[PDB]
Design a protein around this nucleic acid. Structure first.
Lengths: 132, 96, 121, 62, 380
RNA sequence: UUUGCCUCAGGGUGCUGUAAACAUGAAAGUAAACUUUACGAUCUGUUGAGGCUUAUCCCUAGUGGUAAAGUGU
RNA sequence: AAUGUUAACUCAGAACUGAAACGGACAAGGGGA
């Protein structure tokens, strides 16, 4: 409920296709915009976990396809810093479908999940499947 | 003509130049070192010495060659460059 | 300087101009050699020697042919031409036809087979 | 101060240098740097990787 | 007409001209101010490239997500080959600026300092400072009395001693360090005791204060606009190359403005870095100085494997926030802050957890060579 | 520009990585004699050891050298 | 019904191996609606 959100290394620019790793029925997200991105002339908006991401479902349920939804990107293939003396990164690029208010629309996430957003939106703490 | 002991590290002399000039650069650096060390403008490399550093190829001359150089009394002075071979340079400190 | 002598000596050994050799010293004795006969006697006494063609052995694939007979490279990935390009299947058919016609001729020389059971096979 | 032990490596972990990698299964994996995770992520074996203490244990040379 | 799409200009115009610095040392434009209420003490120090590293800490800022949990930080540990104080300069204010009244030299001057006054010291007669150091004390008392009566700024000429460092250079670096305080009549005594000796830092350098760093950046020679100002590369289809600024100005004014990025020198610039808070006090010889009671191992300021392109460090250590400009072996000038602060971090008490000791060159595996030997035991 | 510097060497730190040899050792299984005898990607024990490592890495009053001194004021 | 002299490059499966990787250079279609 407080907005102390910490720095993270940037990856996944607009146009990236990532896995869904959730049971909402979508398979992949196509990133069309990241929220909180300001104005740099030729800069491509790139994804931040604590920020939402506007995405479209290219493969998955038709009820989920052909529209722009919000996703929270959880697992990244680029190393992102922490005060813990070590960064954190993974092998897949993944993000979970959520509503604009922040809470998840599915029920479970297959792989590991991002803990930084689960208290940004308190309902993902309850819906958290297997945190790393 | 003075008795000495030193070598020549050709790696640090040809390390900057390109593939096509490694051996000629080693020749030129050997001549320059001999001239500067023996205080003579007249330096002559031996045909065997030219043989040796062109043998391994243009791309890679030998890394190191052992020198203990002897001048010659016949402007008035001139030097002929030579070498001493060893299986392992390790432990071969400079001396007289 | 020593271009005329080189050209003339190229016509005595019947070799190329790049095959005329001397001693490291005495490098003026060929100017002294204004006649091919001098190089000839110098050759007889042994200071002209066409450099032997460098060492080019053969065993590298002479062992490897027996190695592929052995059968390590008998996989399907050392072949670059098609099945027909390596061995012409028309030639294979011709070889087979010659072999069977020779045998059919021998069998009729020995009369092991009659005509009735000769044409049928 | 307390220092942990790596997954592939065995030396202590000094905060201020590190990274963290996690696979799809959700299992935790701790190492020291990209060179200390590169062959791990490239499906290699510490029984054959000569230059660690795992090969020592797999060739009984302690 | 106007630009279709606006974007901020490339580079800062406040660092022009981007030309080579005229000197190698980092000169100080301005020293911290003085006040009447404040008591008289020292003002600045100096040294060489010492090291800017991490040190493990813990936040106490009320409301952070780290707070009690451990953090990693970044700061610098500084070098002090003891500077030698050899001179005093008096300056007085005039409408044309601040002007020298006189400078008084110490009765005995070192040879490293004397070497700076020469371009060929080996071939010289070493006659510098030979008949000006045997003046009577009467002239000293006759003009230092004028110093306090007329001058308002006092500076101490100090010089480094590179012989205590692995530097090839033998000439000392010379600078002047201000002295700050309150009322003039309290300075006459305080400027009369430390006028010959070398400089121990701990007199003024204290925890929980801010200081600044000043030096000369690395040199890179002539570089294009793409590297000097970071302009956008032109598309690959460009005819006469793509590493340039396309339009260097409009038709009018019929000239090239000085704000247009152009090719030229980059690096070897003069820079000052602000807002570096000092945190800890230490020494050179003492053994329990850098580590803490939570780690209680054995190691100090000492490096490992040798400092690449520098050598070995055998002088004092402290702790200060930040990282430092310039190349290895470059002289670094350390000033205090110009004005301290009273905010949360300004009043925040500071204490570390662990200090690195490893092979800071490349990716080594062993921190202390004692553990390096022990963990391997009987080897070849 | 002689408590310096260059050079080489010793050492250090590293870099790939275990470097040559030994084998009535194993060595897939292979062929020649009346149980032994002609190859064999490698490891096994010296081998967490060789080659390279400033040319812009570090240390060494280690040693070989450090030369003619021309121009201006 | 059989046993002796003498000239192919096509297939096959079991191994193990070598840094889970290989027409090793050269040479050599991007496909689809």
């Amino acid at each position: 409920t407080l907005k102390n959100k910490m720095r993270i290394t940037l990856s996944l620019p607009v146009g990236a296709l990532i896995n869904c790793c959730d049971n909402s029925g979508g398979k992949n997200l196509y990133i069309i915009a990241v929220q909180g991105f300001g104005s740099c002339l030729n800069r491509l908006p790139a994804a931040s976990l604590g920020d939402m991401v506007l995405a479209t479902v290219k493969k998955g349920k038709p009820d989920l396809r052909k529209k722009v939804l919000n996703a929270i990107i959880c697992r990244q293939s680029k190393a992102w810093r922490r005060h813990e003396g070590y960064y954190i990164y993974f092998e897949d690029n993944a993000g979970v479908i959520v509503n604009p208010k922040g809470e998840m629309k599915g029920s479970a996430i297959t792989g590991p999940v991002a803990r930084e957003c689960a208290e940004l939106w308190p309902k993902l703490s309850s819906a958290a499947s297997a945190i790393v | 003509p003075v008795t000495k002991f030193i070598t020549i590290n050709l790696s640090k002399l040809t390390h900057k130049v390109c593939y096509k000039r490694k051996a000629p650069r080693a020749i030129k650096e050997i001549r320059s070192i001999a001239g500067k060390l023996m205080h003579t403008k007249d330096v002559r490399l031996d045909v065997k010495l030219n043989k040796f550093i062109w043998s391994k190829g243009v791309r890679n001359p030998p890394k190191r060659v052992r020198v203990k150089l002897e001048r010659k009394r016949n402007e008035k002075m001139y030097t002929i460059v030579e070498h001493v071979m060893v299986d392992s340079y390790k432990g071969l400190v400079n001396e007289c | 300087s020593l271009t005329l002598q080189k050209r003339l000596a190229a016509s005595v050994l019947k070799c190329g101009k790049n095959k005329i050799w001397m001693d490291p010293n005495e490098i003026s004795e060929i100017s002294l050699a204004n006649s091919r006969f001098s190089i000839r006697k110098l050759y007889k006494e042994g200071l002209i020697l066409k450099k032997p063609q460098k060492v080019h052995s053969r065993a590298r694939v002479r062992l490897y042919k027996l190695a592929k007979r052995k059968g390590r490279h008998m996989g399907i990935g050392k072949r670059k031409g098609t099945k027909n390009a390596r061995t012409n299947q028309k030639t294979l058919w011709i070889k087979r036809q010659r072999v069977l016609r020779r045998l059919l001729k021998r069998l009729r020389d020995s009369k092991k087979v009659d005509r009735h059971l000769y044409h049928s096979f | 101060v307390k220092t942990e032990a790596c997954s592939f490596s065995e030396y202590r972990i000094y905060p201020g240098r590190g990274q963290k990698y996690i696979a799809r299964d959700g299992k935790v994996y701790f190492y020291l740097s990209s060179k200390f995770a590169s062959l791990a992520l490239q499906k290699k074996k510490a029984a054959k990787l000569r230059w660690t203490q795992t090969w020592r244990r797999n060739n009984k040379k302690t | 007409s106007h630009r279709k799409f606006e974007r901020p200009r490339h580079g800062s115009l406040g660092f022009l001209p981007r030309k080579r610095c005229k000197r190698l040392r980092g000169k100080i434009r301005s020293f911290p101010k003085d006040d009447k209420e404040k008591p008289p003490h020292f003002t600045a120090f100096m040294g060489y490239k010492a090291g800017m590293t991490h040190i493990v800490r813990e936040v106490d800022k009320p409301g952070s997500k780290l707070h009690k949990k451990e953090i990693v930080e970044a700061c610098t540990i500084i070098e002090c080959a003891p500077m030698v104080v050899v001179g005093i300069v008096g300056y007085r204010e005039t409408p044309k600026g601040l002007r020298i009244l006189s400078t008084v030299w110490a009765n005995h001057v070192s040879d490293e300092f004397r070497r700076r006054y020469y371009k060929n010291w080996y071939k010289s007669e070493k006659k510098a400072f030979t008949k000006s150091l045997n003046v009577p004390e009467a002239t000293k008392n006759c003009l230092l009395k004028r110093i306090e009566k007329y001058c308002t700024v006092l500076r101490a000429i100090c010089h480094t001693q590179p012989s205590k460092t692995p530097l090839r250079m033998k000439k000392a670096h010379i600078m002047e360090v201000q002295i700050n305080g309150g009322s003039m009549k309290e300075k006459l005594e305080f400027v009369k005791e430390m006028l010959e000796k070398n400089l121990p830092v701990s007199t003024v350098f204290n925890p929980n204060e801010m200081i600044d760093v000043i030096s000369v950046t690395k040199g890179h020679g002539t570089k294009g606009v793409v590297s000097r100002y970071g302009v956008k590369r032109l598309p690959r289809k460009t005819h006469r190359g793509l590493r340039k600024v396309a339009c260097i100005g409009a038709w009018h004014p019929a000239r090239v403005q000085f704000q247009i990025p152009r090719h030229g020198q980059k690096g070897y610039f003069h820079r000052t870095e602000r807002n570096k808070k000092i945190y800890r006090i230490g020494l050179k010889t003492d053994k329990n100085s850098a580590s803490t009671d939570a780690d209680i191992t054995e190691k100090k300021i000492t490096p490992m494997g040798g400092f690449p392109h520098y050598g070995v460090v055998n002088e004092d250590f402290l702790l200060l926030k930040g990282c430092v400009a310039g190349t290895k072996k470059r002289p670094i000038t350390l000033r205090k802050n110009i004005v301290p602060q009273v905010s949360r971090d300004a009043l925040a008490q500071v204490s570390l957890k662990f200090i690195d000791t490893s092979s800071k060159i490349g990716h080594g595996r062993f921190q202390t060579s004692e553990e390096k030997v022990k963990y391997y035991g009987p080897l070849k």
